[PDB]
Design a protein around this nucleic acid. Sequence first.
RNA 1: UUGUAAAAAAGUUUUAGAGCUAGAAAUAGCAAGUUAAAAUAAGGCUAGUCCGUUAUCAACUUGAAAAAGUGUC
Lengths: 1362, 86
Amino acid sequence: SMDKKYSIGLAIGTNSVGWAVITDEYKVPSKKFKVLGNTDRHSIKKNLIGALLFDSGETAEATRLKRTARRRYTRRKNRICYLQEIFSNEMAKVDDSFFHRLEESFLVEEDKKHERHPIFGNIVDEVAYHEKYPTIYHLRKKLVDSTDKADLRLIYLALAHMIKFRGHFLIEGDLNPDNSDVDKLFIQLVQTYNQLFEENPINASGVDAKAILSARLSKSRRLENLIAQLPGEKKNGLFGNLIALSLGLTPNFKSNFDLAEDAKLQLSKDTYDDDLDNLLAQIGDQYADLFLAAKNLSDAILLSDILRVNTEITKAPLSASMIKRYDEHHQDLTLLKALVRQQLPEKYKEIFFDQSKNGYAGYIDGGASQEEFYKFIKPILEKMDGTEELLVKLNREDLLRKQRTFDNGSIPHQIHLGELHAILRRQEDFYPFLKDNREKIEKILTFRIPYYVGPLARGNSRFAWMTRKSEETITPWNFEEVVDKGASAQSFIERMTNFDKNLPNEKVLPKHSLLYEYFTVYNELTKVKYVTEGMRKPAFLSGEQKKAIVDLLFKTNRKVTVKQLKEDYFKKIECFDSVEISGVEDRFNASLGTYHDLLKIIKDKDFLDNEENEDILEDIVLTLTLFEDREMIEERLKTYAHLFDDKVMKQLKRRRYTGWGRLSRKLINGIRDKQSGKTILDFLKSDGFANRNFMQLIHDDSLTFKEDIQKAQVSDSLHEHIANLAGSPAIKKGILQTVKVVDELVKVMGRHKPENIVIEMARENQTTQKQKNSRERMKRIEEGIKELGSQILKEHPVENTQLQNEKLYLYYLQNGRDMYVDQELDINRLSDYDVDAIVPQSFLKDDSIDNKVLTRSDKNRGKSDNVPSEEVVKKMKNYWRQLLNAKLITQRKFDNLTKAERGGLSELDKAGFIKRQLVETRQITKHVAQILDSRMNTKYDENDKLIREVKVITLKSKLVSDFRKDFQFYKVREINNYHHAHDAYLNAVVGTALIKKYPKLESEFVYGDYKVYDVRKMIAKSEQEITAKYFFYSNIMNFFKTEITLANGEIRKRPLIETNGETGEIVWDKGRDFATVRKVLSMPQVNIVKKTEVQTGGFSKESILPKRNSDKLIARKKDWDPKKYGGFDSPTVAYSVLVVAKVEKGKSKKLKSVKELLGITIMERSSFEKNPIDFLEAKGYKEVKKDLIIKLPKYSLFELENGRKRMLASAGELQKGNELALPSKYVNFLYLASHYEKLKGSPEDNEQKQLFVEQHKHYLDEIIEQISEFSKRVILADANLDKVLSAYNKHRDKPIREQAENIIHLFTLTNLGAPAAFKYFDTTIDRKRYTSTKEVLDATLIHQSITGLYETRIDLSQLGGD
Amino acid sequence: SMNINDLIREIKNKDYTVKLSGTDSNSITQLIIRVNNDGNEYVISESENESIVEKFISAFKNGWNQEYEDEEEFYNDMQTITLKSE
RNA sequence: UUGUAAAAAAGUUUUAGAGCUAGAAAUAGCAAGUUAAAAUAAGGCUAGUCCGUUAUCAACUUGAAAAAGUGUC
Ligand SMILES: [Mg+2]
């Protein structure tokens, strides 16, 4: 040939990028490629098709939490250093090596430069100290309460313990009932609850919550005792489950919110914060304050239980309480030993000595948690007499407690400040420097760097923005007069603002913006319809009615419901009697929450409604979103001191808001439609007959909004464009690889650009697989069957796992009746019945339940090629309505069933099916297309219009997935990785065929600005009309088929050679072109490349292990020998290095030559990269040959004998390097055989397919020989293959479907990558590992470019010599 | 039982780096456990019939399989995880 | 839908909290336990109350680095 035009297909994913080059005839070209290196291979022919595989891109989060933990340790460390600075000179006069002894307290005695007893320096005073003060809290109480002069070392220790473990900062200011007491925090919980459920409040008037909740009963008992005081409230209702959350139980909120899957929550679980986020995702952000208030009360109960508060008043309530716990632990322990010794003396040893058991010895000495200890003794207590008290204490979770323990995070710093301050006042007269530093020392404990300041950097931190107004070290004491608080806060606001996607350069509003919330109510309010006595059609809400509703319902209540709408407004303002509401279910989801927060706080309804003040209020909400530092809130509200009273001024600051929305003020109430001068929010209020919302108004091409949005999105560099994407970091990695593939392919093709780039992008986060939707299926039936009042679930038991049978799902959805005739179906004879498409396959390929029905015979739909008949519609409409009101059919499905009442399928309907087929809805695919398009089309013409040389086309995956199933180009991902490449080829085929047949449809699926054609004008009014009108049967993939069968069994034939009539170009030859596709998919040479990468991240496993004299442990500090101190195990190899050098083999120091593989640990990496020969020489090697030091990152590829390949997993393990190209004929057999049951299609061919698997049962033996010849050659797991070969024999007579399903498991023996366990029926095959890398050192290392087309082959057996 | 994120959490608590891969609609999802941080990697991929958590439990319930000494600890740790789910 | 700032509670590790009676030991019998210090990526220079686990990476040529080249009429 001579034609040089080509097109590129791509399949972007998070672990793979498939790519293919095709020609105008859909063939994949083949080119010779230069092979560089030192071997005898100087060129290969390669097919231009393949896929790049890579490890997932990871988020910066784990890195971030480790960064913040480091800052916290650094700054806690410094608080202690500040204290010691203040103590040093006087401590020196008292004990001049005291601080030395604490510094070295960790060292073994051999290494201590001082005497081993930290506090006093001799054994007698230390032993006596500990007997007098068994815990640090005895020292703290004594120092708080006594008036004696105390040793300065003991004073230091008590201050240091409060300053190093200073407690939480969740409460602002001094502690008082309203921020700390159980009763006040309980009230706030019910106030919050009554705010969200005005119709059904909690009335807690006489309810002594402090006493009920603070008492010394178990958690479940306090829940009962509380709920017992609230008539109307079940223990497991919403309020009960909130109280259970507050008490530390684990309520299930599922049934509360009518969820399909249960929502268990526990405030103490490490998972809690995003377990709550996943709950709030479903039920609504409106409930966040409810769970917050539950959380606050939780702290107040826990702290109440920690402070055994009483009227033996101390200034040291916390230390006092811990002493009490110490003493009670002692008493119960003594009694436990006595009871054991008397009744179970053989268990004494175990419980008190055996620290590998979860008894008392494991509890104190063996790592057992309190929870674990309790689970171990409880059966033992229950066995003994006199254990009733102890068991009460246990089931109260108050037996043998320690003082340092998990509750303590609910201790406010203000408590440690209390004791800290008392102590200083005691001793400040015996030690003047304590008096002179008292406020310095309390500042060390109380000071806290504000969020809005950030790290206190000085130029060398990419995370910092803080601003100085004096170049000197910032301390807790000079902070306010050294930090420029104002300028730092300014920089904070800039960095923390998100910009509007729809219209960059505009900040987004707070999620609690009054405008956002007005906008959100009016956008919900505009789709609501109604009917009353004396009305033709369901009318929309007049803008004058929307405006009156938001003024009398939404500006008076928080939740407005269909009741107060239908009653308080319609039947009380508009003189109606009964109004049908038909756009809004139980109530309105949106709310003017912020309006009512401000109404309640500001108590000035006129002020709030004066849309003159709207900037003041939005700036207020803005400040309470950006900030929590009350000192910065005070400064940023100072201007409105004239506007508000000190009583409402105070209450404002204490109100917090968090969250951003998606939109900017300019978008909502900025840009105006040219002709109308209406902003978007202007439209949501008034719009006449057609009442459009937001997603319509943007999408609507009849206005100026969509154009200006595009004109807006205008955006420099490449990594800029990729950072700026709304996308996961995995997808951004895959996108960047995709760009690199396109560039390399352009090079390969003579630096000529392609005609088209066809893109398809995987959907992310398809993690759960199979169960989640099958509980939804059950949820829908249970609500719907009940809504009908049907007895169908008692007559026919419910089990959500056979709801995955679609026939059985539809049976229940249809209340067990024919969807097309008023008759019953037999649940036991579903096999006799037909599932039928409401809208036939010829207009659209919609196989969801939304478009399916179960009828005894699909001929009950009628004789049309359309939606079912007018006759069916008149006979069944009223039954369909019942099913609709009961939510057993969607609204959409109701409209399709009844379409014959409205003439049937209109051109408008068909035009929408066409849009549905072509238009990729996802934003991320549009931004990928723009990056590629901006990269390919760089030149402009004589009129300054961009010259679009390359068309970049986005395909919905459904097109190619449907193509595969229609023409039996089946895919089986388990066999090998080729399917990634095949998908890219198939996108190229379909996308380029589409763009040939349907040029006028360009704007729908090619990036750029094209003529936008009214698609209705392309739709023939009749089949006889067939001229320039593309479609009668709306399914755009019809031209591939030779026959299509209509919904009434009529068959329409198409030509073998499909052409574009307007342009003459051939688009598809059903002889040639399918054979081309089949031939491509069967090619064994596909370039599969696994991207090689250096490993980053943590140095090693994290457990701090006890000491061993195993030299394998890594010291935690430079001078801590792990043989004395413990350390870390299992470091991580950044990359391996090939080293050729000499070593010594004996006492002679004679030099043996060596060629080894050395793993460089992440920790060693900088050291090695700075002086590689110094590094290697210090490891043994001598005479190192620097020029042969080959960096070998993970997945470096080697080829051995017989095309056998290995990949490098580390310096001491290999992975499988080969792909098993199973012939295309065995692929479709495996798919058909193992889906023999679940077939999905016409019985005429679904029977034809089944005979195909019957008549090719011998492929079973052929496929096994394929597996076996590949394995003997490149797997080299002999014993394993012997085991699978006999296991295939033990089952040769099991059914074909079953043998095929298990043969698919067999491919993990052959897969690329790490060897993995698998099963063949019951036989289990253990993975054969490649634990030796020696053989790799004489193989061929293959450097591959990203497409694998360009390679350098290095024969390593030529190294090791001169 | 326990779900995939529970299992990942439990494995991490045993001080193993572990990654979920292949969560595209394109790729087969695979749990990968870095057994030793030196190239030994235990991979459980998801099948249509059987899930990762199901494969994990049926593989580690009976503890070690005596195949590789450098994995005896790793099998003990994974077994304790199986017990948890009850 | 990414990215970022502030804080806390545990946990681990080594040391300090003189174990006693009987015994030649081996060992047996008992007593006891709840606390603390310090480290919490080795570390780095820019020495900050900063930074140290994300992103980025075939080979070869040129660059300080963005990046640019090398295989093809
Ligand atoms: Mg440090």
